[PDB]
Structures are given as C-alpha cells and as structure tokens.
Amino acid sequence: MDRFQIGDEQLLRFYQLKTINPTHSWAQDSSK
Amino acid sequence: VNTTSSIYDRIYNFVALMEHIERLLVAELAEDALETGCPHLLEIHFLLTSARDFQEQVVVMAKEATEDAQRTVMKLFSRLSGIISKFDKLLDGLTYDIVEMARAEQISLAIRLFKIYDLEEREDLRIEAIRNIIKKKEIEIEKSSIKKLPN
Amino acid sequence: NSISEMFGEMREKYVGDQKFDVLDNMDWIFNELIIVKEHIANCCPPHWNIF
C-alpha cells in the first residue's frame, strides 16, 4: 503493498509545489 | 494484458493487509512531526494506496459486473481494510493535514508536505472526477450521440 | 479556509467578551488566515488554501 508506487513521493508529485519539506519528488501540477 | 489476475490477488490481498497497516502508517498522526510525520509521504501514501484502492473505489464503479461476482465482493472485505482504510486514511491525514495546517505555523515542512498531498491528490482528484464527469460528458458527448442519436 | 473561517467564526465568543471583541480574536485568525494562506500557497500551488 500500500505504498502504492509511489504515494510517498511520486503520487504526492501530482502537484508537489513544496520545496523543501521535501517529502515529494517533482515537480508541478499543470502543463497545459 | 487481459490477464491481470495475480496482480489483483496479491494487490487486493496486499491492498487489504498493507492498507490495514496503512490505516495507521499512512494514516499517521499524533501530533504533527511535520503533520503526520510527512503527509506527502503519509497521507498521499494513503492517497495512492487509495488510488490502488481506487480499483476498489473508482474502478469499483468501472468494474460493475465485468466478468465475475467476487471481483468486488471477496475483494470488498479486502477493501474494508483496503479502500476506507486508505481513502479515509487520506482523509484522517487530510482533515488532520489541513487541521495540522490550521496550527499557527503550520508548518514550513508540515503544511508543505501535508498541503502538497492536498494539492496533488486534490487537483488529481479534480481531474479524476472531472474525467468521470467527463466520462458522463464524454459519454454524453459519445453515448448520447449513440443512444440519443436519435435513431 | 473554513478552518480559519471556522476558527475565525469560532473566535467570535458571542457576548462580545467586552462588547465587540469578536473581530479581535477573529481578525487575529484573519491574520493567521493571511499567514496560513500565503504559507500554503508557498506550500501548495494547485489547492489547499492558496489565497
């Protein structure tokens, strides 16, 4: 399992505008 | 690709057991220690653990009598500790994230991680249920161009 | 924004604790609403109390 590849970093990386907790890799929320 | 059986058995079973564990680990609290500690790790770990259990929350509404009867029944007791022990774990971590973000600092890493989960799964949830409302609007565009052709 | 607008609305203490000290602690929670708001937009761009 219930990570769930990757709720630690990469699924918190759906926005992750928070540098630096860091707690989440990269990078943004919208690219349109 | 139509043979996703063992991933659904070890991931519905591991979604049961490991999100029973993530009903405390990814539902981390008491008190902040950077809001869970680290609710971008923790509460968003319950978000993706609830996105892997969106197979039992949102794709339970996609798997509506697909091929069998226990895909959402024998896995539903695997979703009792799987879905509402991950989605409400992300909502104990989310109501305790924003409540932890309601804690006077709150903080330079607690609201960073916690709010980062609450923008990642927030806007991801917004485009997600906007993709389901645009599945009734892309189906209202599509199946209501088929059922409501009118023919 | 309803935790600073339920903490803010909760900081009224409707008496008003002299006669009109509701906006003292309530507007103090509005200062904490600006600090938590801009701190959270510094934290999260997409959601979670931008402004």
UniProtKB/Swiss-Prot annotation, chain A:
Domain of life, source organism: Eukaryota
Further remark: Present with 3400 molecules/cell in log phase SD medium.
Family according to the record: Belongs to the SEC5 family.
Function: Component of the exocyst complex involved in the docking of exocytic vesicles with fusion sites on the plasma membrane.
Known partners and oligomeric status: The exocyst complex is composed of SEC3, SEC5, SEC6, SEC8, SEC10, SEC15, EXO70 and EXO84.
Protein name as catalogued: Exocyst complex component SEC5
Name of the gene this protein is made from: SEC5
Curated annotation (Swiss-Prot), chain C:
Protein name per the record: Exocyst complex component SEC6
Additional remarks: Present with 1080 molecules/cell in log phase SD medium.
Subcellular location: Cytoplasm
Family: Belongs to the SEC6 family.
Function summary: Component of the exocyst complex involved in the docking of exocytic vesicles with fusion sites on the plasma membrane.
Subunit structure: The exocyst complex is composed of SEC3, SEC5, SEC6, SEC8, SEC10, SEC15, EXO70 and EXO84.
